[PDB]
Write a protein that binds this ligand. Sequence first.
Ligand SMILES: *[C@@H]1O[C@H](CO)[C@@H](O)[C@H](O)[C@H]1NC(C)=O
Ligand SMILES: *[C@@H]1O[C@H](CO)[C@@H](O)[C@H](O)[C@H]1NC(C)=O
Ligand SMILES: *[C@@H]1O[C@H](CO)[C@@H](O)[C@H](O)[C@H]1NC(C)=O
Ligand SMILES: *[C@@H]1O[C@H](CO)[C@@H](O)[C@H](O)[C@H]1NC(C)=O
Ligand SMILES: *[C@@H]1O[C@H](CO)[C@@H](O)[C@H](O)[C@H]1NC(C)=O
Ligand SMILES: *[C@@H]1O[C@H](CO)[C@@H](O)[C@H](O)[C@H]1NC(C)=O
Ligand SMILES: *[C@@H]1O[C@H](CO)[C@@H](O)[C@H](O)[C@H]1NC(C)=O
Ligand SMILES: *[C@@H]1O[C@H](CO)[C@@H](O)[C@H](O)[C@H]1NC(C)=O
Ligand SMILES: *[C@@H]1O[C@H](CO)[C@@H](O)[C@H](O)[C@H]1NC(C)=O
Ligand SMILES: *[C@@H]1O[C@H](CO)[C@@H](O)[C@H](O)[C@H]1NC(C)=O
Ligand SMILES: *[C@@H]1O[C@H](CO)[C@@H](O)[C@H](O)[C@H]1NC(C)=O
Ligand SMILES: *[C@@H]1O[C@H](CO)[C@@H](O)[C@H](O)[C@H]1NC(C)=O
Ligand SMILES: *[C@@H]1O[C@H](CO)[C@@H](O)[C@H](O)[C@H]1NC(C)=O
Ligand SMILES: *[C@@H]1O[C@H](CO)[C@@H](O)[C@H](O)[C@H]1NC(C)=O
Ligand SMILES: *[C@@H]1O[C@H](CO)[C@@H](O)[C@H](O)[C@H]1NC(C)=O
Ligand SMILES: *[C@@H]1O[C@H](CO)[C@@H](O)[C@H](O)[C@H]1NC(C)=O
Lengths: 767, 775
Amino acid sequence: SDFYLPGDYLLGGLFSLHAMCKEYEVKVIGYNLMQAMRFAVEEINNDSSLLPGVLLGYEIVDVCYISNNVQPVLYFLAHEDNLLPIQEDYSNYISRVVAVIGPDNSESVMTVANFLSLFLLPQITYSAISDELRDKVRFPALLRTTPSADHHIEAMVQLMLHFRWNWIIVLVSSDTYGRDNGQLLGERVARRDICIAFQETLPTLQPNQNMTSEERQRLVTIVDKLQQSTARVVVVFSPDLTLYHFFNEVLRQNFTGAVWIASESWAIDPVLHNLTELRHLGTFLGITIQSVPIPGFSEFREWGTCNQECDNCLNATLSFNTILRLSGERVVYSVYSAVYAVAHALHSLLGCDKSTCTKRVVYPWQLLEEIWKVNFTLLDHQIFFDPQGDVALHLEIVQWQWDRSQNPFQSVASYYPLQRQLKNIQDISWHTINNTIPMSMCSKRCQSGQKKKPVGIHVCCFECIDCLPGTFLNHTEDEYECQACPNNEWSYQSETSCFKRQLVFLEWHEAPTIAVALLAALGFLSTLAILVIFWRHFQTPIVRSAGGPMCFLMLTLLLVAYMVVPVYVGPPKVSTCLCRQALFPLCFTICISCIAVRSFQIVCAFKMASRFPRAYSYWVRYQGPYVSMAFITVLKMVIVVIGMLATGLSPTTRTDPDDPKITIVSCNPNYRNSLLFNTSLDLLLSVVGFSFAYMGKELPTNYNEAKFITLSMTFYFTSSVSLCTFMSAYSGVLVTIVDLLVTVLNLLAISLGYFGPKCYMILFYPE
Amino acid sequence: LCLSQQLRMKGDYVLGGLFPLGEARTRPSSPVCTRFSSNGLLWALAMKMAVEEINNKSDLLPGLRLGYDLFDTCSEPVVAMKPSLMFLAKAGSRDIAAYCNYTQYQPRVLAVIGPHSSELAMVTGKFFSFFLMPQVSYGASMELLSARETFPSFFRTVPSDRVQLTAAAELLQEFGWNWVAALGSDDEYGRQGLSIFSALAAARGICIAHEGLVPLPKVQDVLHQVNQSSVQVVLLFASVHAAHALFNYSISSRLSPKVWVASEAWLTSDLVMGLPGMAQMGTVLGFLQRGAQLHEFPQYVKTHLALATDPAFCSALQRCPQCDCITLQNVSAGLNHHQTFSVYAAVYSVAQALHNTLQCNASGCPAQDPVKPWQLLENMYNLTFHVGGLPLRFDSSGNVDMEYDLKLWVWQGSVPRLHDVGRFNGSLRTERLKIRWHTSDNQKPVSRCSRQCQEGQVRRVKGFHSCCYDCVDCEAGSYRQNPDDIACTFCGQDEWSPERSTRCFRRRSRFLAWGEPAVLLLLLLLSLALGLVLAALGLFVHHRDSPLVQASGGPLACFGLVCLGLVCLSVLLFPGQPSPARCLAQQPLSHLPLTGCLSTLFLQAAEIFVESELPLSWADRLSGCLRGPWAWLVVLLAMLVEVALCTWYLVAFPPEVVTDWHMLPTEALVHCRTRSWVSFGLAHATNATLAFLCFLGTFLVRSQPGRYNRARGLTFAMLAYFITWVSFVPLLANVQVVLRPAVQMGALLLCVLGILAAFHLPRCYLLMRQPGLNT
Ligand SMILES: *[C@@H]1O[C@H](CO)[C@@H](O)[C@H](O)[C@H]1NC(C)=O
Ligand SMILES: *[C@@H]1O[C@H](CO)[C@@H](O)[C@H](O)[C@H]1NC(C)=O
Ligand SMILES: *[C@@H]1O[C@H](CO)[C@@H](O)[C@H](O)[C@H]1NC(C)=O
Ligand SMILES: *[C@@H]1O[C@H](CO)[C@@H](O)[C@H](O)[C@H]1NC(C)=O
Ligand SMILES: *[C@@H]1O[C@H](CO)[C@@H](O)[C@H](O)[C@H]1NC(C)=O
Ligand SMILES: *[C@@H]1O[C@H](CO)[C@@H](O)[C@H](O)[C@H]1NC(C)=O
Ligand SMILES: *[C@@H]1O[C@H](CO)[C@@H](O)[C@H](O)[C@H]1NC(C)=O
Ligand SMILES: *[C@@H]1O[C@H](CO)[C@@H](O)[C@H](O)[C@H]1NC(C)=O
Ligand SMILES: *[C@@H]1O[C@H](CO)[C@@H](O)[C@H](O)[C@H]1NC(C)=O
Ligand SMILES: *[C@@H]1O[C@H](CO)[C@@H](O)[C@H](O)[C@H]1NC(C)=O
Ligand SMILES: *[C@@H]1O[C@H](CO)[C@@H](O)[C@H](O)[C@H]1NC(C)=O
Ligand SMILES: *[C@@H]1O[C@H](CO)[C@@H](O)[C@H](O)[C@H]1NC(C)=O
Ligand SMILES: *[C@@H]1O[C@H](CO)[C@@H](O)[C@H](O)[C@H]1NC(C)=O
Ligand SMILES: *[C@@H]1O[C@H](CO)[C@@H](O)[C@H](O)[C@H]1NC(C)=O
Ligand SMILES: *[C@@H]1O[C@H](CO)[C@@H](O)[C@H](O)[C@H]1NC(C)=O
Ligand SMILES: *[C@@H]1O[C@H](CO)[C@@H](O)[C@H](O)[C@H]1NC(C)=O
């Protein structure tokens, strides 16, 4: 039969022909790889440059997926008489086979390598991707012709990164394959800023049998939890057998819009593509080995003890001939390269010089030692074994195309294990409306100048909350928290660049301030002329019966107040406010006190002289108005000093509600209470002064003093009430100019309503 | 000592043996382990004791001798494979043939006492299963060894990990911690435990917040992920070393205390148990096995050690060459080891299966051909064997059944002790009244997820699986647009929303309506003011020829009364729906007649002042001109200047009917608003100046007793005007915005009432009641 070929050195094989093994259903891939190995050995026999004059044989034994993994290896290690000796050292042992091409799945390879470790027979497994075969401590004589699952996971991660998918879904199987792949991908993905929405285990369910109600509920739960999630990249680590029911129920629930990523198990499975209803679910990417065109192999394949036979293999392979031919060869080159690796190792071990061979007896451990160091070329591919027993064959991301006229599995990317880089990506026919890359992000990109706030355990998921007014976001420093701008400058909503608050204050060249300046200059000129006239006429009954020194000091203090009026306008400094609050309130209060004491002494003194005679005698012996004036003045310095100690001295900066962009500057941080106290004292003096004037309003006294005092004092009362109501009903930029207006007009009242009629009767009434 | 010489014993049926007697390439030579292991020798002596006791008993295997081959297997499988091949080789020959199936084999050992390690047990069982060799393995626990598809001949005497993981899941479900974190060691033990616990938790409704693998002696990432979720119960299904490393790192980092559900690996390990600072890591509730102990094993082993020390016996009579150069204190550390009973019961189970297969009684046991190893399997399922007075059974999957004990750690003087607070025999039964927790009080640490979200909430999927929803309440102004939405959506800013609401409610306008009680009281005040105005007007037009009105104006008095009435009438337009024309014309129609009345009163005041405090020379010219056609011209000039100013600040200052969508909580606002203090301030400037000049010219006068005081009414009218508006301004500045037109109305109405009661009321009083003074 074709399962045996005598030669100088046999070369055992282990292929999964069914999934005794005869009663199981036949598999086409096993026979395909079997024919690959046969063709490789046959072409080794043909080639006179490789192994010249040394016939190479083989002994292929059918092994099931799991069931048969012990008897074939014992057959391999038995002598020609079917007896395997037991001894401590096997260096002198000669086995029937010289090497073995291991099974196609991880577990049977693990068993065969565990049992062959004693003898150190080389074993080049193919398409076994488990990473527990990477270490040579427990598998000293195990090799590979297929990149490990590490590179499959790396290709998947690079594919997600290239298309900007950072929110995925992992589905595994109850088997060890799915569990290990899921854990490996989860460990790999946590360091590339890609999150896993959820990982779920698909129950094991072989086809061609009826499912249970509990499993149906399980699947409907899986697909419900799949659909309710916002991730649109579903990676599946599961053998192709149990994925029929899951996809059937997915079609049943009518779920669409997911980019399925397939592991190597079902990325090239024909039957799932043959279902031909998956084309509406979305795109079906997958990871698989690059197809290497083996010359003169399709024609060779088409030309053609126990558990060592098959009958229905050819009939089964007949139906899948066209799909296999158009799809190319994926795992066939793995077996081809493994057989050539053994051949090159044996050729180098025999020390052949492409014409002669020493034909020395070969121990399998010697062949392993030589095969660990093979580096040749094969179909423009370099075949060399890495120190952990692998050869870097290019991987490939393949996108399923539902058209029988061309390749059912069309390549879209190539992965190079040596560089760990995925490159050469072509166009992919997506499932979107206008062929746009599907979006699989959990959190939208935040608008410029917006704080990022994590919402769950996943780092890539967050909520965008805008920065509150007065702060921005420095993306360079940290994008998770707002950073406010120092130096007393404000920021608007969603603003990343704080702007300096412009300092607005009373400037010389403005309309209200120039009006105030003109009014104050008119008052100053009028009162200066009044002083000039008063000094021009003295020894006059009006200026002598009334207080001469009193009026002179009052008018000089009014002159000073007018001259210091313009210090208000300009940049508010410490000296500015100091002189302002030490001159204006002092002078104004001293003027009001003099007016009140004059009205008192001209009206109420006559009435008081009747009840208290000695009080009047004391008042006239001394200078009662002078001492009362000094007492009120010292009270005023005391109160201004205590307000000084309370409210401070440095000019303040307050943000008006009108516009945070502007910042008015006054000199008193607490102006409301300070002006309230000042006006309270002024009005407490004003009420008694006005009452004293009004009780004696008709008396001629010193040329109708009570009448003018009354009119001026009522004018001040109304102006103070106007200030109070304006301040209570308004707070903004015009507060300072209003304070100037009211202060200067109060000064005008005190000047005019108490000195202007004097000048009137002096100039126009010389009688 | 030659203790190793007894590792063989001839008999009709001889058992195998794989024990860890030793401990730890280019050539195919098996590595040799020279390090000595006390546990392996204790187990081998235990099985030797069991075999000797079987041979002592006459009711078990009568008239037969049972032997054993105690072979050394290091933890490595390469050194353990050769004893297996030796077992399967034909007796008396040193080779094993490769036949098609098991039936052609005649193994030299009836059964094999499998390896303690489970990683070795996998390979050994997979090799033996081809020949259907009965294997009973002490200590092999992980579950997939029970799969009869790949291990048809593999039995065991320790419970699988499935039973203890089911016990842990039932514990978590019974105490109510349905939101836990599962951890496992990096080896196969932890991975299998995590997978099994994943399945069990998914079945039982428990969710796993985070599934991570603690690496063998990274950890920082696993601890950070565990702490990221609000989980207070962590199942640590790890080996001794991984658990020790985890707990040491948590000690260094000062992790918050948690309820660690302990696997049997590290629950009773003294390395983890005596770790410094361990008392600050919460309660540790594990499920220790409940298995008997050989009460006579130490005496037996000490007797045979002393007896092998005797040269006579052993001289009268390798696998473990290091076992000969040992002494008694090199093994005394582990005499009370619970795997001794597992080995003892495995030997008894094999012997009982052999006895049943020979189907023979206590008196004797009939002669027959020697029984093949694979013939034991048909009789070793359902097997019921008594080991020291305790019955045990082999399930259909080769797993023995025994119960567990829920043991927690207690702490007094930093000395931890184990205490029984439960029992798992297939149905957990805990005594939680005596359990002492780590919380500040004796309260169970809450760790729970919301399986479903209450109506009106947004749901956010949590857990490693999409298990439980983090129900979140979001503030007012938002609603749950769809049940599947992650976050609630705002609505159109023109409609309010209550807290915890599925949908928004439309905002409806609420202005100053005609039915408001304040509106009613001000309408009553308006009607009273109108009645007073009409009465005064009738009085002044009836007695028009009297000196009263003649001195107090005349036609000007009636004109001012009509103006006051028209101000009262124009007060009526403030309320209601704020039509744009109405809001625009509020101020001018509320100010023109008031300006007219104020100007009339000011002309009266000016006449009084001229006749009072002016020289007669100017008086004879001013008095004769200030009354009559020139008075009409003056009041007309006042009215036209007011009208010009009114049109100026209506064309310049726009009075806007704004709709404040975000002032009232649940209802809309329609506000008639004008410029702040500038519009109505400029409108009030003329009235203020007229009133101020009137007050100034009137509030001093000489009122001789022989004349009527024509100034008191004017002074008090002007005073009332000033005080009512001064008090009004802060009322405008502080009253809630809806009642702002009502405050406007009150200002105007009190203004009219004050001017009436001060100026016109005193005149009318003497006009009606005492007409004897009108000369
Ligand atoms: C070479 O191999 C082919 C198949 O590839 C086989 O048919 C043929 O007999 C071999 N020998 C020669 C000399 O062609
Ligand atoms: C279940 O599957 C079996 C096996 O093919 C089939 O005969 C049967 O019709 C299916 N349905 C039910 C309801 O049993
Ligand atoms: C689409 O989904 C609906 C709702 O689940 C389902 O009833 C229907 O069968 C699905 N397929 C089609 C073709 O409508
Ligand atoms: C291939 O897919 C088709 C389309 O559904 C299906 O009918 C056929 O059975 C599949 N298998 C083959 C041709 O082997
Ligand atoms: C293949 O199937 C045909 C019928 O289509 C049958 O006659 C033939 O024997 C089969 N070949 C086998 C089983 O090798
Ligand atoms: C194999 O040989 C080629 C050709 O000289 C060389 O480029 C390559 O690096 C070699 N590989 C190793 C692993 O030495
Ligand atoms: C795709 O193509 C159509 C037709 O030209 C175009 O109108 C549409 O905007 C495109 N789709 C998208 C999502 O941009
Ligand atoms: C923002 O970060 C940059 C880069 O570190 C730094 O130079 C700068 O001072 C930070 N602040 C602002 C206000 O730009
Ligand atoms: C077996 O019985 C003998 C006496 O016949 C006794 O010395 C020995 O200790 C027994 N073996 C045991 C208990 O293992
Ligand atoms: C084992 O193989 C032999 C081959 O001669 C066969 O006769 C026998 O029935 C087989 N026994 C089994 C399959 O149990
Ligand atoms: C653990 O989480 C808490 C709560 O979020 C946090 O305060 C703490 O810093 C975290 N880390 C440690 C080591 O406790
Ligand atoms: C415990 O953790 C500390 C801090 O990480 C580490 O340095 C130390 O080696 C650990 N202890 C042991 C006994 O390994
Ligand atoms: C017996 O114990 C001694 C003292 O600890 C030790 O030196 C010796 O190696 C031990 N023997 C062994 C391990 O075989
Ligand atoms: C049990 O079997 C033995 C051995 O054949 C026989 O001698 C004996 O009589 C039987 N019956 C009893 C009751 O022991
Ligand atoms: C033996 O096991 C079978 C399993 O099907 C069971 O039906 C039977 O009752 C068992 N016999 C016993 C426990 O005696
Ligand atoms: C387990 O023990 C309880 C008492 O704690 C008993 O009621 C129950 O029947 C037992 N169950 C089994 C399966 O042995």
